[PDB]
């Protein structure tokens, strides 16, 4: 029962320019009033060890911004993120180059990832066996099909062992004969009591895998709590949205977007 990630009043703002003259004036003039867009506004949530959290929301809600702030790639405008343990992100397209072959790409990605040479030399055969590419592991990646490239990326990425893990729409990869292995590998992380943040639009996988749910609407956190209490509300809202007429949907979207855009 120890906190793993603690977030207090994280805010992210972006400035909106229409023409180059406005940007040039904003850069030069000391005090200038320009439009400001609030990607996130006053988000605070405390995550304990072993808690799997699923992020749900509509397009443009601000889930990827929160995931990048937690993962350290992005910096909040106001507030701080207090975390313990290392953080790893699952992204298959990060380190794969078409010119380099599969064997070279394994070493390239593992080196950029942060592993020493001796570990890479040991872990390479397991990756080669897991990917199931076969003879094509020596061919350049540009010759690969999309599924083979995705499988190689997943095989390279699954080797991480962090304290905190962030996944983004990468639970399974490839055809039906390959998804089960990825699911078992992902579950193995759950059995080791690691904090996991899952961002996806698939409600079945979220129900099967996650433990707590965070609902983000219009850059703010609507609700935080157990899956059994929060997910039904999101499903009910989604069902309600379908029955509304087009004018009502447009009015809802306009009301949502009005609060985000401010002048300051």
């Amino acid at each position: 029962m120890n906190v793993s990630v603690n977030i207090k009043n994280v805010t992210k703002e972006y400035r909106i320019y229409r023409t180059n003259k406005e940007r040039m004036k904003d850069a030069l003039i000391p005090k200038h009033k320009n439009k400001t867009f609030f990607a996130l506004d006053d988000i605070s949530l405390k995550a304990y060890e072993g808690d799997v959290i699923g992020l749900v929301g509509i397009n443009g809600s601000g889930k990827s911004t929160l995931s990048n702030i937690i993962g350290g790639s992005l910096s909040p405008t106001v507030g701080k993120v207090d975390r313990n343990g290392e953080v790893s992100v699952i992204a298959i397209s990060a380190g794969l180059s078409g010119q380099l072959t599969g064997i070279e790409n394994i070493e390239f990605k593992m080196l950029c990832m942060g592993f020493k040479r001796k570990e890479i030399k040991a872990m390479t055969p397991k990756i080669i066996e897991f990917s199931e590419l076969g003879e094509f592991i020596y061919q350049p990646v540009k010759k690969y099909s999309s599924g083979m490239r995705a499988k190689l990326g997943f095989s390279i990425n699954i080797t991480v062992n962090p304290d905190i893990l962030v996944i983004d729409e990468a639970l399974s990869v490839g055809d039906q004969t390959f998804a089960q292995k990825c699911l078992d590998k992902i579950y193995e992380f759950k059995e080791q009591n690691k904090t996991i943040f899952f961002v996806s639009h698939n409600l079945g996988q979220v129900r099967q895998f996650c433990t707590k749910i965070a609902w983000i609407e219009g850059g703010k956190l609507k609700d935080y709590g157990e899956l059994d209490d929060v997910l039904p509300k999101y499903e009910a809202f989604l069902n309600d949205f379908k029955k509304k007429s087009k004018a009502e949907q447009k009015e809802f979207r306009n009301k949502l977007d009005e609060s985000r855009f401010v002048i300051k």
């Binding site: 992100v89 010119q99 390239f108 990832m113 942060g114």
Partner: protein, 270 residues
């Protein structure tokens, strides 16, 4: 003072990663060519042939300089320019292009330009070896003065690395610097003794004095003294060495300070 310590620690711990990534980049660049990595040496040879045809036969009709044939004089003088030009040009856009891949991985961000520079240092070393072998074939053989290269060759790499370290951050923050670098590179090329000696051709009161403030002047003259004239260059030109060392230190300090200030916000600017 923490900026210098952080950058120094990162480099001295990630030497091996720098070398490996430089080799991988060299492999990536020349993938589709039939000849492969041979172009890294083929292109400078053709450019040097063109430069000798224009500036050697036209302007002076291949008259010897200091008793050495002009071809070898130019060969020793110009063997370094391609490395500096390519490193400064390509490493200015290193962080802009290579930040996305390593943004989400724990990576020392200050070593991105260094392996870009190393990928050209390899070709520079190859060209230097070829030039030395050709000069030996001429009838000029190495002496005890060739050991000055162990001091002079790393200086070129350190100068290029520091300049690139500053210009990468400057280009990331403002994108006009990458366009502005070309004229400065041309100025550095033409105001140097690589192609000509202005003392004989024209006046020396004005043109020569400005040339002494150009580091390329010192680098080319030191290489020529070590390889061709067989003399200890630091015996009578120590003030130039001190001035160049001061320039290197200033560039490194400024680049380290800027990089430490603006590394966490590199996502917003990109």
């Amino acid at each position: 003072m923490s900026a210098i310590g952080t950058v120094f620690k990162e480099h001295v711990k990630n030497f091996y990663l720098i070398q490996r990534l430089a080799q991988f980049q060299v492999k990536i660049i020349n993938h589709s060519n039939y000849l492969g990595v041979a172009w890294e040496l083929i292109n400078p040879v053709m450019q040097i042939m063109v430069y000798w045809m224009v500036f050697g036969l036209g302007i002076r009709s291949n008259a010897p300089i200091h008793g050495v044939p002009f071809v070898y004089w130019l060969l020793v003088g110009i063997s370094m320019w391609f490395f500096i030009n390519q490193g400064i040009l390509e490493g200015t856009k290193a962080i802009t292009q290579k930040f996305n891949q390593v943004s989400k991985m724990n990576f020392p961000l200050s070593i991105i330009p260094t392996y870009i520079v190393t990928s050209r240092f390899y070709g520079h070393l190859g060209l230097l070896l070829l030039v030395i072998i050709a000069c030996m074939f001429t009838g000029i053989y190495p002496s005890i003065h060739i050991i000055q290269l162990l001091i002079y060759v790393p200086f070129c790499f350190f100068l290029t690395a520091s300049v690139t370290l500053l210009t990468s951050t400057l280009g990331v923050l403002v994108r006009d610097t990458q366009m502005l670098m070309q004229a400065i590179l041309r100025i550095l090329f033409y105001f140097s003794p690589i192609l000509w000696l202005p003392k004989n051709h024209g006046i020396s009161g004005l043109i020569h004095e400005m040339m002494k403030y150009n580091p390329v002047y010192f680098i080319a003259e030191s290489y020529r003294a070590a390889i061709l004239y067989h003399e200890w260059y630091f015996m009578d030109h120590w003030k130039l060495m001190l001035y160049n060392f001061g320039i290197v230190a200033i560039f490194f300090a400024i680049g380290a300070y800027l990089h430490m200030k603006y590394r966490d916000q590199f996502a917003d600017f990109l």
